[PDB]
From a paper:
We chose [name], a ligand-inducible aTF belonging to the diverse TetR-like protein family, as a target for computational engineering of ligand specificity. [name] is a 1-component transcriptional system and represents the simplest molecular mechanism for converting biophysical interaction between inducer and protein into a complex biological response like transcription. When induced, ligand-binding allosterically lowers affinity for DNA, thereby allowing transcription. [name] is a compact, dimeric, all-helical transcription factor with a large cavity between five angled helices forming the ligand-binding pocket.
The crystal structure of the computationally designed mutant shows that one of the mutations reshapes the binding pocket to favor resveratrol over naringenin through a striking change in its binding orientation while maintaining allostery. [name], a mutation critical for resveratrol specificity, creates a large steric barrier that alters the shape of the pocket and obstructs the vertical binding orientation of ligands. Resveratrol is accommodated in the binding pocket in a horizontal binding orientation almost parallel to the plane of the tryptophan. Unlike [name] which plays a clear steric role, the other three mutations ([name], [name] and [name]) have a more subtle effect in reshaping the binding pocket through nonpolar interactions. [name] mutation creates a protrusion in the binding pocket that increases shape complementarity to resveratrol. [name] is buried between the residues in the binding pocket and the dimerization helix and may play a role in positioning the [name] tryptophan to stabilize its horizontal orientation through van der Waals interactions. [name] allows the formation of multiple hydrogen bonds with nearby water molecules and may serve to stabilize the structure. A different hydrogen bonding network consisting of D71, R75, and E78 make hydrogen bonds with the resveratrol molecules in chain A and D71, E78, D172, and a nearby water molecule make a hydrogen bond with the single resveratrol molecule in chain B. The DNA-binding domains of the resveratrol-bound quadruple mutant and the resveratrol-bound wild type are extremely similar with an all-atom RMSD of 1.0 Å. The altered binding mode establishes that allostery is robust to major changes in the binding mode in [name].
Residue numbers in the entry:
A (entry chain B): 3 to 210
B (entry chain A): 4 to 210
Write the structure that this text describes.
């Protein structure tokens, strides 16, 4: 009965339908008019909320980080006493949500496997670059905090370690999406997280 | 001769497919689009490829060729240094990615420009088959390294092959996305050894 609350409901309906449409048919061939029909909204309504498909993809991508922001900011805090432990809790929660939450799984599948970078829609690649650079900045600081607190080797190259951890986690998530019944990500989640952290703690190649 | 002409036509089609897929992506490119870009007519592309998924697979299969010698060596139970063969394999994989325009662009197509959205689902099915085949070979090569004492005796060879694939595949994709951020060629030894150190040293990878 109020403008803002009805707008928020319509926006959520559009995003939910976009996840269903992109997951089934992919981003390239899905139109906003298609998503409007699936959502039960008018074309005027969808173009009111989103200028183009790139803005809907970004809404999906930006929706992933809210769950973990509390543990991420803690790991990045220069006053946090256990930054490596916050990083481990962050990685456990990432994997747990991926396996358990149908929405998170479907969005990750869309971004990994149903969404092309093409220069006719250059914003998709540009916004993915910004998201990964932002993650890298956070993890570089979290790992530097861990080194200062004696939880990681003193000569750790924090930048390269953050890249190595991102490579491993992102590669494991994509492998699981491709071949889920191949790897028990939920049952062995602690093992999978600790494999990545062990690389950072123990590999001499990651020292300066 | 018919045989040499058909081989040249196939190569012309595959080269045009790389150009077309890189520019416009796989989803919206048809075989008819690729044939026009290749200068190939009278329906010849359909004599070479049953559908677009087969052309994607041809690009994917072309990546194995350079590395086959080192991969088979690493998997041979007669090889004396199966971990060293795997190291040389990963060095070449990263070197070719940075140096070879064709390998780089094919990887960019498969990682970033190729939706799992075809009718017969063959694009996803063949990617699954390809990764399972890599996994089978890497599990064998790591099991050979364990047998030679080059990796821990209690290593979970299957999980270690998954962890190494995750790291390597993730690092390649990370580099394709942000090439100015990772000196893949300059520090290639460090990047390869970081991954091999994970398998050699992580207790989480032991049974
Ligand atoms: O494949 C993936 C690779 C990396 C990540 C990281 C997510 C993440 C989420 C946060 O809230 C803070 C952060 O610093 C990182 C998620 C998935
Ligand atoms: O990210 C990756 C990029 C390339 C590869 C190649 C693996 C490979 C496996 C084989 O059995 C034979 C071969 O010639 C290559 C694996 C992972
Ligand atoms: Mg969430
Ligand atoms: Mg090659």
């Amino acid at each position: 009965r109020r403008t803002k609350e009805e707008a928020q409901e319509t926006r959520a309906q559009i995003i939910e339908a976009a996840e269903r449409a992109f997951y089934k048919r992919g981003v390239a061939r899905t139109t906003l008019a298609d998503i409007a029909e699936l959502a039960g909204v008018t074309r005027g309504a969808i173009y009111w909320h989103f200028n183009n498909k790139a803005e809907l993809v970004q809404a999906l991508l930006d929706s992933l980080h809210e769950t973990h922001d509390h543990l991420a900011r803690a790991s990045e805090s220069e006053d946090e006493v256990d930054p490596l432990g916050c990083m481990r809790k962050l990685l456990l929660q990432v994997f747990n949500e991926l396996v358990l939450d149908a929405r998170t799984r479907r969005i990750n599948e869309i971004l990994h496997h149903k969404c092309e970078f093409t220069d006719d829609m250059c914003e998709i690649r540009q916004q993915r670059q910004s998201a990964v650079l932002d993650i890298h900045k956070g993890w570089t600081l979290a790992l530097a905090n861990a080194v200062r607190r004696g939880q990681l080797p003193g000569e750790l190259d924090a930048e390269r370690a953050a890249v190595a951890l991102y490579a491993y986690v992102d590669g494991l998530i994509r492998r699981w999406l491709l071949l889920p019944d191949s790897v028990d990500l939920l049952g062995d989640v602690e093992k999978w997280v600790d494999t990545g952290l062990d690389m950072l703690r123990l590999s001499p190649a990651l020292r300066k």
